[PDB]
Design a protein around this ligand. Structure first.
Ligand SMILES: NC(=O)c1ccc[n+]([C@@H]2O[C@H](COP(=O)([O-])OP(=O)(O)OC[C@H]3O[C@@H](n4cnc5c(N)ncnc54)[C@H](OP(=O)(O)O)[C@@H]3O)[C@@H](O)[C@H]2O)c1
Ligand SMILES: NC(=O)c1ccc[n+]([C@@H]2O[C@H](COP(=O)([O-])OP(=O)(O)OC[C@H]3O[C@@H](n4cnc5c(N)ncnc54)[C@H](OP(=O)(O)O)[C@@H]3O)[C@@H](O)[C@H]2O)c1
Lengths: 426, 426
């Protein structure tokens, strides 16, 4: 119908005040939100709507002549306080949601702005207390999708037990404002160059995510995570799919995501001698955050073997590709800020290659994609499992054998051995 | 065999001293010339080899430690003096060429560094006096290939009467050091994207030759010629062919040139309402040659209606293309120095487009291409005729009706109406 509730589970939190409260303001402010939308915060910390505004409006960029819309926005806002495993609380939520205008019939969008240590609990209660009887129910689950296959599996199974895959919006939104455009053009590209993109013409596909800036004083988070999990397993691996996938049956969210998965099921398990891990050390003869290395960051615990740059060769194995090496190369603290897919062709009779680089605005597009109900740019349960199947074995070997990453100087291309790997293949 | 003669017909001239004498030095100097090569100058002006050196070595970039090769080069040089229609002179040439070591058997390369007002004469004499009996004979003919169809036809017929098309090397070499690379990648590109490049995917191909610099004090030459003849009829029209051509039967000089011609025969005659001619006026608020316009050049005769920039729509008409408008856009004194072919695609469910931009070194590659005997990057008699057939009617209408070109400010993109034309089509 025409009435929507946006439940921000964990409204006290950072993602809460710093991204979603604002990002929703910017969709209200420019009337992209369904007209009869309400916002309900739900955490333990006993606070008022006014209280949220005071710490959050800073990040809004409220200009003294839009402040009559804004007043109307906080009029739509409420907050109920309660535990995440206390049916009495989820009760005091669900019954307050019925109070709101047409709440009975209303659509329900649940944003789990909560560390997934509490997902099993929150999901179970939302199921049996809070789900709309008439309205659709959609849960936005946040990274990490677990750390290995075993863990992502155990959790993903808990959620796909309570919720249909068409209610599970897994949101990755951390690699910057253009992050969805990346995925669009690489699909618009599979369409065009489909008949060309074969082992026949192509020798070596390379997908590249460079960032120039460091970990910047938050290395301590990046640490318990690492560059393979932060960029490759999720994003790079996804666009690799968009390149190698077949003609989707249609343009349906599920027909494409099907095709992506089909690619993934035909990649076997990345092995160590196809991988060059690299950690950044600070710059002698530079200035800014570039004098500081990874280990100079005081939130990184002493002597971290954590990869801050990786180069990895995957083979898709079927008729269409095969021998064809996909190279995923990505790093924090490098030379440029580049996101590009290069396809090198067999220069039969200087090698020849094709390159692909990069008003609603990535995160914003994802909040609307979920309200609309297109699951396109979100990862599917089965897509994720396959993704983990691949990297887990390597990842497990690294946690265990704790191999020292190849030092590389801040603002470098990466380690030298990374390029020597690209060549040892094609 | 292993013995070659390079006859520079018109050795006194500019192209003589400023380009070919040097360019051959640079192929001798880096031993790319067949080992037993001789150089013979032939003009009227009674001068010595020494005499050539004095005015020409300046342009050589002779470095005081390669000057033992160089001595050996001028040892290979000679010069015989004679008229261009005096069988007694062509006699004193041909008999002096027999004198040279193995001249009897020798291969003969004739460079017509002569204004084509004398081509009919020189060609006829060379035929009946000078052609090697054993060795191959190749004539390098220089621009202009005439000015209209009637004229290019009358001359081209005179030459294709004395010489097999596999002896007629028509050399265009004036649009800069990378000019052959342009044509290479656009063919390497027809190969790759062949199956894609259809009316199905593509809406609007645009081929673009911008130069930032003026006519620079030599407008007076450009004038009796004009931007359609200087850049479009010849170069742009050629790469249009390389884009739209079919799979050549093989990679033979003649199989490809065949395919190019096939494209051209399927373009009908450019008409005036598909054309935006533009002349540059100098820059008020700039400096250098940019204060000066076209007409401020003192070699341009007062009130010239001469096009210094053109935008033209051609339609290739067959199954493969059709409706598909090729737009050729080119200008002297513009914003950048760009040579690029853009292919815009039908963005089914911001318009999407493919772009193509840009040790032996263009002119150098052409001198060797002719010694080797690959006629690839040279225009064919029949290719040229078709080229002229197209532009002549328009061109004739402009000489006759003398239409004032749209003024455009130096360092501009071109005239505004040029873009309004691109849109009135696609
Ligand atoms: N790239 C990334 O991986 C990335 C970036 C940012 C965040 N995230 C994800 O975003 C989600 C939200 O994190 P956040 O940054 O907003 O901050 P957070 O402070 O970790 O979580 C926000 C709220 O969660 C509650 N909370 C925190 N720790 C808890 C615990 N151990 N037990 C129970 N409740 C707890 C608190 O609510 P109350 O005190 O009010 O009850 C807190 O204000 C997480 O899933 C996180 O993994 C992902
Ligand atoms: N983009 C272009 O269109 C371009 C650029 C440069 C030149 N070209 C072409 O290059 C060729 C050579 O021209 P150039 O620049 O070297 O200079 P040029 O001086 O016009 O010709 C060189 C020599 O030709 C002879 N000559 C000149 N005018 C003559 C006439 N009316 N009758 C008889 N002989 C004559 C003279 O030789 P002697 O006094 O020693 O007998 C002169 O030294 C021409 O075909 C020209 O069209 C093309």
């Amino acid at each position: 119908s025409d009435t929507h509730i946006f439940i921000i589970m964990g409204a006290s939190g950072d993602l809460a005040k710093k991204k979603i409260y604002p990002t929703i303001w910017w969709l209200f402010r420019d009337g992209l939100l369904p007209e009869n939308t309400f916002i309900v915060g739900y955490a333990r910390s006993r606070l008022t709507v006014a209280d949220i505004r005071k710490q959050s409006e800073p990040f809004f960029k409220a200009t003294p002549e839009e402040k009559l819309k804004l007043e109307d926005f906080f009029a739509r806002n409420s907050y109920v306080a309660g535990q995440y495993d206390d049916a009495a609380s989820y009760q005091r939520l669900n019954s307050h949601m019925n109070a709101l205008h047409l709440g009975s019939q209303a659509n329900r969008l649940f944003y789990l702005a909560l560390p997934p240590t509490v997902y099993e609990a929150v999901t179970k209660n939302i199921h049996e207390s809070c789900m709309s009887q008439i309205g659709w129910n959609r849960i936005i689950v946040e990274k990490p999708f677990g750390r290995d296959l075993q863990s992502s599996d155990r959790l993903s199974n808990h959620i796909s037990s309570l919720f249909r895959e068409d209610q599970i919006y897994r949101i990755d939104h951390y690699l910057g404002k253009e992050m969805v455009q990346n995925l669009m053009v690489l699909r618009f590209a599979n369409r065009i160059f489909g008949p060309i993109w074969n082992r026949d013409n192509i020798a070596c596909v390379i997908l590249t995510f460079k960032e120039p800036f460091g970990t910047e004083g938050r290395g301590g988070y990046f640490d318990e995570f690492g560059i393979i999990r932060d960029v490759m397993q999720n994003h790079l691996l996804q666009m690799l799919c968009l390149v190698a996938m077949e003609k989707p049956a249609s343009t349906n969210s599920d027909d494409v995501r099907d095709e992506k998965v089909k690619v993934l099921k035909c990649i076997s398990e990345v092995q160590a001698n196809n991988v060059v891990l690299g950690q950044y050390v600070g710059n002698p003869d530079g200035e800014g955050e570039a004098t500081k290395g990874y280990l100079d960051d005081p939130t990184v615990p002493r002597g971290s073997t954590t990869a801050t740059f990786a180069a990895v060769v995957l083979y898709v194995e079927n008729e269409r590709w095969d021998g064809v090496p996909f190279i995923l190369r990505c790093g924090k603290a490098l030379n440029e800020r580049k996101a590009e897919v290069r396809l090198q062709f067999h220069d039969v009779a200087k090698r020849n290659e094709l390159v692909i680089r990069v008003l609603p605005d990535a995160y914003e597009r994802l909040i609307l994609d979920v309200f609309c109900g297109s699951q396109m740019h979100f990862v599917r349960s089965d897509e994720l499992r396959e993704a983990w199947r691949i990297f887990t074995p390597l990842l497990h070997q690294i946690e265990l054998e704790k191999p020292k990453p190849i030092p590389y100087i801040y603002g470098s291309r990466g380690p030298t051995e990374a390029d020597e790997l690209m060549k040892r293949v094609g």
